Design a protein around this ligand. Structure first.
Ligand SMILES: [Mg+2]
Ligand SMILES: [Mg+2]
Ligand SMILES: [Mg+2]
Ligand SMILES: [Mg+2]
Ligand SMILES: [Mg+2]
Ligand SMILES: [Mg+2]
Ligand SMILES: [Mg+2]
Length: 54
RNA sequence: GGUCAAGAUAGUAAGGGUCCACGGUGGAUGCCCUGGCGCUGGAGCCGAUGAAGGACGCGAUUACCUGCGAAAAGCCCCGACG
């Protein structure tokens, strides 16, 4: 299921980039906060990959 | 006092010179250290699970440096500080 939440994050992240090329970007923090949720995502996936399979 | 004669003799500065005073220039000098040099003593290999050194790129705004790498001034677990 993890990839679904990853890509849902990626869509709004690109939406923020698109506004940021424009004059609208009132909450820049949401930018970097959206990316760490991606990284944590991927990280935890690797944390399951070794688990169980050994 | 006046005229004539003969004689001697100042001052003037265009610009200059020596000295004094006030600056401009310039960055010597003292002081300092954000940087070096040397000795002693430690520690001493990286790489095909990708080295050394790089090229692009990552930031709301980022030309240079750092750090980092599309999971990108970073992600997770432990411990320390508070
Ligand atoms: Mg005469
Ligand atoms: Mg002087
Ligand atoms: Mg010194
Ligand atoms: Mg290397
Ligand atoms: Mg950008
Ligand atoms: Mg990937
Ligand atoms: Mg502290």
């Amino acid at each position: 299921d993890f990839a679904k939440e990853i890509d849902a994050r990626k869509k709004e992240l690109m939406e923020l980039r698109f506004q940021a090329a424009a004059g609208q970007l009132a909450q820049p923090h949401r930018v970097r906060q959206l990316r760490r949720e991606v990284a944590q995502l991927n990280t935890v996936k690797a944390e399951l990959a070794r688990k169980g399979e050994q």
